[PDB]
């Protein structure tokens, strides 16, 4: 199907310890494969997947130089935004950056994104045309202008449509045995009597990859979105994900509710009913 490589950077300022803390991670689809921690003695881009260790030491040197550069530019961005929003040096703040590229089943360029956020709110994004920018507040207008001056759009597009997708393909075909897979969910259903005149039907769907999954409840065919407890897809630790969806059911009406599951690994969706 469709694959994606996304890079995440997080830098948090701590007045009193000077140098902010900077953590960066790399993901291919829903699998982390690289990392860098500022306060780590390593001071190098470390691997987090087994299919990336194949790369030689030159690759790691280049990636380390790059990520350290990105750390510096973040250390500048913190102060710059402190000036823009006119905030005091006595306050902690967080700068977040995310950018990557996607490819379709033909392994060609479909989408590419790049976006900055300051303290959890969107700061400046790249629209899906890769030529213009989305600016949130007056402070981001200045950045938008600065970038429109140095033709950052064309450069970033040249990267996303070139190196990004290429080495995404390389990563896919290197770690093929894990990244190129579709583990169907292992669904089951539990039924707990919350009371004498009620019940809870919990629909478990666990051990599946990728994380993209749909899990809904229906009563007589219509969705129970208003009365459905739904946790967020959570990791298991071995590269698979878990998710369950529960509903409150009047006692004696279990046969009316059905749990619907959709995932890339299931040829056709699944429909479950208790007993």
């Amino acid at each position: 199907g469709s694959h994606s490589m996304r890079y995440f950077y997080t830098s948090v300022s701590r007045p009193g310890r000077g140098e902010p803390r900077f953590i960066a991670v790399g993901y291919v689809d829903d699998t982390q494969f690289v990392r860098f921690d500022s306060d780590a003695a390593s001071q190098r881009m470390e691997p987090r997947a087994p299919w990336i260790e194949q790369e030689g030491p030159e690759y790691w040197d280049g990636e380390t130089r790059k990520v350290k550069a990105h750390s510096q530019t973040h250390r500048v961005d913190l102060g710059t935004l402190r000036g823009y929003y006119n905030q005091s040096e006595a306050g902690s703040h967080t700068v977040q950056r995310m950018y990557g590229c996607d490819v379709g089943s033909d392994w060609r360029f479909l989408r590419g994104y790049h976006q900055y956020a300051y303290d959890g709110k969107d700061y400046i994004a790249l629209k899906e045309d890769l030529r213009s920018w989305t600016a949130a507040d007056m402070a981001a207008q200045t950045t938008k202008h600065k970038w429109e001056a140095a033709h950052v759009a064309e450069q970033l597009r040249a990267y996303l449509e070139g190196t990004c997708v290429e080495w995404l393909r390389r990563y896919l075909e290197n770690g093929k045995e894990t990244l190129q897979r579709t583990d169907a969910p292992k669904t089951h259903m539990t039924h707990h009597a919350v009371s004498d005149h009620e019940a809870t039907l919990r629909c478990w769907a666990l051990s599946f990859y990728p994380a993209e999954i749909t899990l809904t409840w229906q009563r007589d065919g219509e969705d129970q979105t208003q009365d459905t407890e739904l946790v967020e897809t959570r990791p298991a630790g071995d590269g698979t994900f878990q998710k369950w969806a529960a509903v409150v059911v009047p006692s004696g009406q279990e046969q009316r509710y059905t749990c619907h599951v959709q995932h890339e690994g299931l040829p056709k969706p699944l429909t479950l009913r208790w007993e």
């Binding site: 790399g26 990636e63 790059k66 990520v67 990105h70 961005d77 935004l81 700061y123 990267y159």
Partner: peptide, 9 residues
């Protein structure tokens, strides 16, 4: 592989 350009705000 990640981007080679420095991008300041």
């Amino acid at each position: 592989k990640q981007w080679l350009v420095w991008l300041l705000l």
